[PDB]
Amino acid sequence: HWGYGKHNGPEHWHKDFPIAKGERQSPVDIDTHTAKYDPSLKPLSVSYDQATSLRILNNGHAFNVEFDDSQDKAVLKGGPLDGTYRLIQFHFHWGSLDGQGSEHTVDKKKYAAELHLVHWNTKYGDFGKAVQQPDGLAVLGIFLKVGSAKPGLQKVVDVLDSIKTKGKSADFTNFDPRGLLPESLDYWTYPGSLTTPPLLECVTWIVLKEPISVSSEQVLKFRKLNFNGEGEPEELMVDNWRPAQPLKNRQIKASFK
Numbered sequence: 173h174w175g176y177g178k179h180n181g182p183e184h185w186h187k188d189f190p191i192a193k194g195e196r197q198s199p200v201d202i203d204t205h206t207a208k209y210d211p212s213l214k215p216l217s218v219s220y221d222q223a224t225s226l227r228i229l230n231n232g233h234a235f236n237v238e239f240d241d242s243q244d245k246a247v248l249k250g251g252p253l254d255g256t257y258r259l260i261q262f263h264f265h266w267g268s269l270d271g272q273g274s275e276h277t278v279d280k281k282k283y284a285a286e287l288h289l290v291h292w293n294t295k296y297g298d299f300g301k302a303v304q305q306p307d308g309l310a311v312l313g314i315f316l317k318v319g320s321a322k323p324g325l326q327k328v329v330d331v332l333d334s335i336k337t338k339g340k341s342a343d344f345t346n347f348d349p350r351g352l353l354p355e356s357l358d359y360w361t362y363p364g365s366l367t368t369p370p371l372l373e374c375v376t377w378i379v380l381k382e383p384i385s386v387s388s389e390q391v392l393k394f395r396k397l398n399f400n401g402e403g404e405p406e407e408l409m410v411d412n413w414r415p416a417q418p419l420k421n422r423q424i425k426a427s428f429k
């Protein structure tokens with residue numbers, strides 16, 4: 173089973189998931205000087221007012237806050253996207269130290285963590301079909317830096333004690349993901365992939381320029397989670413990020429000048 177350890181981490185993934193060495197892998201370094209402003213890019217439309225969170229799950233790789241995606245309740249549209257993409261879950265990647273944890277980097281800078289809000293293109297009917305399409309998913313990525321607390325994150329932080337180990341889930345209703353966004357929706361965008369196996373090349377990445385700030389105490393609580401299941405040897409869930417992959421034949425576009 174793949175993971176983030178010395179013996180099953182990102183350098184090993186290609187042996188079971190050969191697309192790991194593909195033409196549009198994620199994450200990437202965002203070279204801010206080389207990214208080109210695209211004045212034809214529309215503003216993002218984030219419509220989360222009717223979002224229905226259901227549950228939070230430790231899946232052994234991260235924790236997912238899951239949403240009801242059986243109707244257009246929380247959707248992403250506009251920007252580089254054609255059509256409507258429904259929010260299915262969000263999760264984070266984070267480090268063992270404040271100086272690493274993000275998957276995307278900005279001029280080689282690593283942030284302490286990165287939030288991924290995962291959406292699937294409604295024209296494909298469900299998430300499983302969507303991941304088989306080159307325009308199946310839109311993932312909104314948001315960097316986290318350590319400073320002031322993010323009040324809208326605290327409800328997530330406080331439930332983590334109940335899902336410490338792999339396979340644990342807890343009810344998690346009425347959570348409003350709007351509380352996780354920064355003020356600005358300026359973004360970079362490029363075609364890429366899932367950043368974990370199966371590494372499918374199905375994602376339009378939309379990475380916000382403005383990080384959110386979270387407190388040291390908030391990120392410390394992420395680091396108390398476990399990769400392992402209950403009753404197994406404890407391995408802290410930290411450094412669950414894939415490093416930047418070759419950009420290859422891609423251009424990163426900026427929504428802003």
Ligand SMILES: C=CCOc1ccc(S(N)(=O)=O)cc1
Pocket residue numbers: 324347348349350351352
């Ligand atoms: C649960 C936290 C909610 O966070 C926000 C934060 C801002 C808004 S808005 N765009 O209406 O001013 C709505 C919800």
Ligand SMILES: C=CCOc1ccc(S(N)(=O)=O)cc1
Pocket residue numbers: 288290303311365366367368369370
């Ligand atoms: C197809 C099952 C796995 O689903 C996902 C969904 C999203 C991601 S990521 N880190 O690229 O946002 C990784 C794996």
Ligand SMILES: [Zn+2]
Pocket residue numbers: 263264265288367
């Ligand atoms: Zn992710």
